[PDB]
Design a protein around this ligand. Structure first.
Ligand SMILES: *[C@@H]1O[C@H](CO)[C@@H](O[C@@H]2O[C@H](CO)[C@@H](O)[C@H](O)[C@H]2NC(C)=O)[C@H](O)[C@H]1NC(C)=O
Ligand SMILES: *[C@@H]1O[C@H](CO)[C@@H](O[C@@H]2O[C@H](CO)[C@@H](O)[C@H](O)[C@H]2NC(C)=O)[C@H](O)[C@H]1NC(C)=O
Ligand SMILES: *[C@@H]1O[C@H](CO)[C@@H](O[C@@H]2O[C@H](CO)[C@@H](O)[C@H](O)[C@H]2NC(C)=O)[C@H](O)[C@H]1NC(C)=O
Ligand SMILES: *[C@@H]1O[C@H](CO)[C@@H](O[C@@H]2O[C@H](CO)[C@@H](O)[C@H](O)[C@H]2NC(C)=O)[C@H](O)[C@H]1NC(C)=O
Ligand SMILES: *[C@@H]1O[C@H](CO)[C@@H](O)[C@H](O)[C@H]1NC(C)=O
Lengths: 109, 49
């Protein structure tokens, strides 16, 4: 996890080869590509409660809000298993209104 | 690690709080105090210099 100790990018793995009086390291790394821009927010307010992502960031495609993982764009809908709650929505700078979906009660019809 | 991708600075500070074991609500609920403390700490360096 040391930055730039094993090449440029996120180190995946490395292979050694012998040279005359030396060694050659072939570093395999992961390099992110083809980014898009989005709107973002730190928390989400629902029922007077602030919701934070467990892992990921809240992003908006223009009209809807999703959670994604931070390094590869893979959007999902914001549920109570995606997030955790802390406090009320009066203290966070930049909080946004949206609905956080519960699975249990629409299972219970 | 590649191309520069923008992110707002308080959200970068929250990632970094996660990287030491503190949840990020602890940053967002203290943002103003944390920024005051950083500013006083930076203002103390030029005084010693
Ligand atoms: C943002 O993504 C959503 C996808 O959830 C698009 O909204 C539509 O949402 C309904 C119900 O959620 C789906 O049945 C549709 O298939 C979605 N797409 C369309 C084209 O109707 C929404 O269009 C996206 N917004 C932008 C600006 O890209
Ligand atoms: C990001 O910065 C913009 C300014 O560029 C902020 O927008 C202003 O919001 C205030 C309310 O606090 C309004 O009174 C101003 O009229 C807005 N200005 C513009 C140019 O839109 C925005 O609130 C900031 N975002 C956050 C999360 O603080
Ligand atoms: C997000 O939703 C909340 C919940 O209603 C909004 O809070 C209201 O804000 C208006 C204007 O600031 C007040 O007149 C109401 O009294 C508030 N309602 C409650 C129940 O407190 C909040 O304004 C919404 N945020 C945005 C940006 O529209
Ligand atoms: C955590 O520590 C900080 C000290 O940096 C406290 O904030 C200070 O509190 C004193 C009260 O004695 C104020 O006079 C200062 O102005 C505060 N500093 C800043 C930068 O706001 C804070 O109260 C402490 N929190 C708790 C829960 O004890
Ligand atoms: C994102 O938008 C900015 C302008 O706000 C633009 O300069 C940048 O090239 C865009 N990047 C992508 C991936 O769309």
């Amino acid at each position: 996890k040391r930055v730039d100790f094993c090449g440029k990018g996120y180190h995946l793995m490395s292979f050694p080869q012998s040279a005359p009086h030396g060694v050659v390291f072939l570093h395999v790394t992961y390099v992110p590509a083809q980014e898009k821009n989005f709107t973002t927010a730190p928390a989400i307010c629902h029922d007077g409660k602030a919701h934070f992502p467990r892992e990921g960031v809240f992003v908006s495609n223009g009209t809807h809000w999703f959670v994604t993982q931070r390094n590869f764009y893979e959007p999902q809908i914001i549920t109570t298993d995606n997030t955790f709650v802390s406090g009320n929505c009066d203290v966070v700078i930049g909080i946004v209104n949206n609905t956080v979906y519960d699975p249990l009660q629409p299972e219970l019809d | 690690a590649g191309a520069a991708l923008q992110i707002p600075f308080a959200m970068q500070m929250a990632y970094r709080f996660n990287g030491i074991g503190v949840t990020q609500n602890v940053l967002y609920e203290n943002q103003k105090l944390i920024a005051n403390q950083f500013n006083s700490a930076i203002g103390k360096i030029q005084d010693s210099l």
